[PDB]
Structure 1
Amino acid sequence: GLLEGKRILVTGIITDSSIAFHIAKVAQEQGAELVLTGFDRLRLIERITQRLPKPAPLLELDVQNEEHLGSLAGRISEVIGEGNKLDGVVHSIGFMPQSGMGVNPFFDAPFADVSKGFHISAFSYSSLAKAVLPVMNRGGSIVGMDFDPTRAMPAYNWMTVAKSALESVNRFVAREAGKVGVRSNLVAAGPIRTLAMSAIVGGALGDEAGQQMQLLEEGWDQRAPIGWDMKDPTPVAKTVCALLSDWLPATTGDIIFADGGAHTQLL
């Protein structure tokens, strides 16, 4: 297996459409031993994670909760064994209140909403790394999920701003993680049908949300030289597992695109 014998923490499962669910699934198929975290809906997440190929312990983690973060490393050590450390950590956590996305006016998002979105979507990448690095092996790998924010675009609005901040945070986490021999990278994915993608069509009434998703998928698949399927998270999941493996050992502070090549083409 690609990740045989590696112990990996996977955040961000909420439904079995979640990108983290497919990251966790491929990682287990490739021999990894997982620890999972879940936010808020722990009973529902526990049932969801039973659909994964192999059993894995589930820990509660709200990245806005400094008590959760401060106890996380010790809670991880309790489940993986006294003398054991993590080899990989997956950040697959994002949120932006409704006012910050969809057809809602960009100028009308109140700061309290945008700040919450920045906290969960960008600041928390530093928060999670700070919490887990003490229980990470040298040679380890932290990977976060990104959506290319180089250019502005409709509907993504303030979540785009949060991703721009996340990219910057990743470069600084790589400085800290490198002091202990750990890599830090983002995977910039093309669009995937998840709960997150439903936030993007927020405000659309009627068949508008469906047709907006149709236009998004059509244009992405068109630009991508090898095509793009928003219903298939497996290629993104594999890319994350590639970064969690030992096969990109000189890549850190970086962004690896898993978008079908769409961002390299203009029409």
Structure 2
Amino acid sequence: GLLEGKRILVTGIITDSSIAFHIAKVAQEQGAELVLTGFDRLRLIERITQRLPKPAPLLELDVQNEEHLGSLAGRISEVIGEGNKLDGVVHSIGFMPQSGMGVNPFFDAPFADVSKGFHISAFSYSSLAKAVLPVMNRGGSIVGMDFDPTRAMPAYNWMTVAKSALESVNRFVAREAGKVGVRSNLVAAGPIRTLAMSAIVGGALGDEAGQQMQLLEEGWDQRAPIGWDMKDPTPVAKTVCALLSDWLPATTGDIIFADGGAHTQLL
């Protein structure tokens, strides 16, 4: 397989619609041996991870918890063996309180909420890299998930700002990881119908945000020269696996778009 024998840490599974669930599924199908992390609802997460193709141990990780981060390498070493290291790490983690993403006015998001969203969505890409690099092999690969924030848009609001920050963090992570022969890259995915995204369709964020999301999705598939299926996470998972593989060995600090080509077309 594409990832035969590689040991890969996958963060960010919470449901079977999580992008990270599909990353993990494809990685296992491609021969990878996974370690998974979960935040908060560990019992619920294990129910989900048992439906992956193969067994994988689950470790707790709250990226705001410095004790979790400081112990993470040693906890990984306990499960993969002290003499073994990881070849890949996937950051598939994001959060922004409703005040910063949705129908609340952009100007009205309190700093404490934006700061928490920035912590989880952008700063933690650096935190995770710092925590895992001591147990990563030379030639390894760190991959995070992005949503193209080059231009402003309805509703995404401060999450857009967090993604812009994340892209900048990735370039500095690449500097540090490169010293020990590890690549760092983001995959900028088009919109994917997770459970939360289905709730937006149903008006959970507000009817206005629901209309804006539909407008975005229809235009995305239209613009994309090869189309875009929001209900199919597999192309995104495959692209992450491509970056975890040895087939893009000279790409780092970079952003690879798994978006149907939509961002290359104006209309």
The answer to whether TM tops 0.5 is yes
Conserved 8 A contact 1:102-1:203 = no
- Tell me what 1:143 maps to: 143
Kept in 2, the 8 Å contact 1:3–1:31? The answer is yes
Q: How far does residue 200 in structure 1 lie from its aligned partner after superposition?
A: 6.2
Stretches of structure 2 lacking an aligned partner (at least 5 in a row): none
Across the aligned residues of Structure 1 and Structure 2, the Cα RMSD in angstroms comes to 1.7
**Is the Cα contact below 8 Å between 1:103 and 1:202 reproduced in 2?**
no
Q: How does 1:1-267 map to 2 (within 5 A)?
A: 1-195=1-195, 197=197, 211-267=211-267
Query: Deviations along 1:33-57, whole A, 9 cap, x unmatched?
Result: 0000000000000110001000000
Q: Contact 1:87–1:139 (CA<8 Å) still a contact in 2?
A: yes
1:194 Cα deviation after fit? 1.5
- Shift in Å at residue 209 of structure 1? 5.7
In the TM superposition, residue 102 of structure 1 has moved relative to its aligned partner by 1.1
* TM-fit CA distance, 1:170: 0.1
Distance (whole Å) between structure 2 residues aligned to residue 209 and residue 40 of structure 1: 28
Distance 1:242 1:161 in 2: 27
Counterpart secondary structure, 2:99 = helix
* Alpha-carbon offset, residue 101 of structure 1: 1.1
CA contact (8 A) 1:103 1:204 kept: no
Identify which range, 194-203 or 138-147, moves more after superposition. 194-203
TM-score normalised according to structure 2 size? 0.96
Cα distance in 1 between the residues matched to 2:156 and 2:202? 10
**Inter-partner Cα distance in structure 2 for 1:108 and 1:120:** 20
> Unmatched 5+ residue regions in structure 1?
none
Helix, strand or coil: the match of 2:3? coil
Partner Cα separation in structure 2 for residue 257 and residue 148 of structure 1 = 8
Greater CA drift, 23-32 or 209-218: 209-218
Q: What is the SS of the residue equivalent to 2:186?
A: strand
Deviation (angstroms), 1:215:
2.3
CA apart distance, 1:211: 4.5
1:113, distance to aligned residue in structure 2 (A): 0.1
Structure 1 residues 106 and 210 mapped into 2: Cα distance closer, same or farther (>3 Å)?
closer
> Could you tell me how far 1:82 is from its partner in structure 2?
2.1
Count of residue pairs brought into register by the alignment: 267
What percent identity do the matched residue pairs reach? Answer: 100
CA contact (8 A) 2:5 2:31 kept: yes
Q: CA deviation at 1:205?
A: 6.8
Deviation at 1:216, TM superposition (A): 2.4
Give the drift of 1:214. Answer: 3.0
1:143-172 deviation line (CA, Å, top 9, x unaligned)? 000000000000000000000000000000
Q: How far 1:4 sits from its partner (Å)?
A: 0.1
Tell me the distance in 2 between the aligned counterparts of 1:37 and 1:28: 15
